[PDB]
């Protein structure tokens, strides 16, 4: 994991994104979405990640 | 083979209906202008 002033960016594309293996996973300390609701992410489609 | 006093009424009314139609695409300070894109990616609260 890089540091805060040289953070690393990975672009995600060309795949189904299952946040179901992430949202029903109780292993993170903060999961804060802005502009979306973390329970409706499997009904949308996105251009990039 | 003149009628501008009648064409003025037609034009003013069409010009008002066009503005009413076109105001349906302003956000008024929301995230989207279309209601279904607020309903689809947001929850009731």
Q: Taking CA A15 as the corner, what is the angle to CA A48 and CA A29, rounded to the nearest 5 degrees?
A: 75
Euclidean distance between CA atoms A17 and A26, whole angstroms: 18
Euclidean distance between CA atoms B14 and B19, whole angstroms: 9
Residues A35 and B41 sit within 8 Å (Cβ to Cβ): yes
Residue A41's Cβ-count burial label (10 Å; 0-12, 13-18, 19+) is: middle
Euclidean distance between CA atoms B36 and A43, whole angstroms: 13
Quick one: how far is CA B23 from the chain centroid? 3
Euclidean distance between CA atoms B17 and B32, whole angstroms: 23
Residue length of chain A? 49
- Which residue in B39, B41, B45 has the most chain A C-beta atoms within 10 A of its own C-beta, making it the best mutation to test that interface? B41
- Which residue in B30, B39, B40, B44 has the most chain A C-beta atoms within 10 A of its own C-beta, making it the best mutation to test that interface? B40
- Resolution (angstroms) stands at 2.8
Euclidean distance between CA atoms A24 and A17, whole angstroms: 14
How was it solved? cryo-EM
B24's CB contacts (< 8 A; 6+ apart) are B33
CA-based nearest distance A36→chain B, Å = 5
């Amino acid at each position: 994991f890089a540091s805060v002033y040289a953070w690393n960016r990975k672009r995600i594309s060309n795949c189904v994104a299952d946040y179901s293996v992430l949202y029903n996973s109780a292993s993170f300390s903060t999961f804060k979405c802005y502009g979306v609701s973390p329970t409706k992410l499997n009904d949308l489609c996105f251009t990039n990640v | 083979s003149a009628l501008g006093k009648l064409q003025d009424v037609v034009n003013q009314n069409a010009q008002a209906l066009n503005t009413l139609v076109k105001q349906l695409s302003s956000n008024f300070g929301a995230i989207s202008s279309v209601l279904n894109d607020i309903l689809s990616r947001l929850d009731p609260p």
